[PDB]
């Protein structure tokens, strides 16, 4: 999406 990555990715 320009999807955000999770804190631990």
């Amino acid at each position, epitope marked *: 999406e320009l*999807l955000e990555l*999770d804190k*631990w990715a």
Partner: antibody
Amino acid sequence: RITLKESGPPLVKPTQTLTLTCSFSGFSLSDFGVGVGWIRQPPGKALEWLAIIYSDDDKRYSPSLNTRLTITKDTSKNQVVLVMTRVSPVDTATYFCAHRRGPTGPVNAMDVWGQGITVTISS
Amino acid sequence: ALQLTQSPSSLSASVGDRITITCRASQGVTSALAWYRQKPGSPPQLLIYDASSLESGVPSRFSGSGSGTEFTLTISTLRPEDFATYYCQQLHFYPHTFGGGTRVDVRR
């Protein structure tokens, strides 16, 4: 071990604001990477992700509910708080807070859930 | 957002049955997928984390495999206490989506 518990009003009026608290023990929002999230479940529906807050005050919300939610933490009281504004009857659901492990694989899941609290929106 | 599709959505079985269940992600979420069993009146319970790892305390009958976009949960011999609803959650992208759930009831 780890145990969490949600509290607040089981009955709230449309438009009014809903404030919920997650009181936990067995861990502290001081342990690097630890997270505490909020998940809600409408009666007969599936789980819905609401928001997450970690040890650094790192925060994330549901894009769809983003201007209606505010999540905070008090490390003295070991509590996390969720504020949901202008609620309507579609917010009637059971709200769960949960624990997320921090970097030691095992952070990929919410490992301990509270038993949840049933909130009903009626005027 | 990232949609997680669970299949089947509902399924009927009998004790001692072998069942497998799936969760499809519209985008690769690596191994960042968790499985939960939720009995009525009770909250979600972690069975599998990081897509393939059995959570401590959980019966060995439960197993999980998958990666990227395809994931499955298998119950080698289902027990009476396994008649509940199962969900998958991905924690790779924000927000952390949950699937619609698979309801497992008793066949008659």
